[model samples]
Target: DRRKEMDKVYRTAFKRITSTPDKEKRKEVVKEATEQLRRIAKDEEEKKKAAYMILFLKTL
Candidate 1:
């Protein structure tokens, strides 16, 4: 269920960016990713995973 939530958010974010060429919209996705990370990344392992995700996420 937790992974499902992350997948849902990732899908939504990918859709949002791919569906539009707006830089601001992409920025919104990035901001959302941050909030989502912070929200779900409560434990040390979670935080580390989130950090890694962010690293690859930025490349996208």
Candidate 2:
């Protein structure tokens, strides 16, 4: 249930990041999402996945 819920959260964050036109705002969104993800993620794999997602988000 957690992974499923996290996936939904990730998708929503990803959409927000992609939709935002301003660079600073996008970075802010990413930072917030990353923090939320870090806070919610209890497993090592989830943390690692969040880290990877953060890396990917930086490019956009």
Off by over 4 Å in 2: none
Question: Which tens-of-lDDT digit does each residue in 1-60 have in candidate 2?
Answer: 767776776788889998998988998988888888788888999888878877887787
Sequence-dependent TM-score of model 1:
0.67
> lDDT per model, in order?
0.69, 0.83
Q: Count the backbone clashes (under 3 Å) in each candidate.
A: 0, 0
What's the CA RMSD of model 1 in angstroms? 2.0
Candidate 1, clashing residue pairs? none
- lDDT for 33 in candidate 2 is 81
Residue 13: error of model 1 in Å?
Answer: 1.5
Least accurate 10 contiguous residues by lDDT in model 2: 1-10
Per-model TM-score, in order, reads: 0.67, 0.86
Which candidate should be chosen as best, given TM-score against the real structure?
2
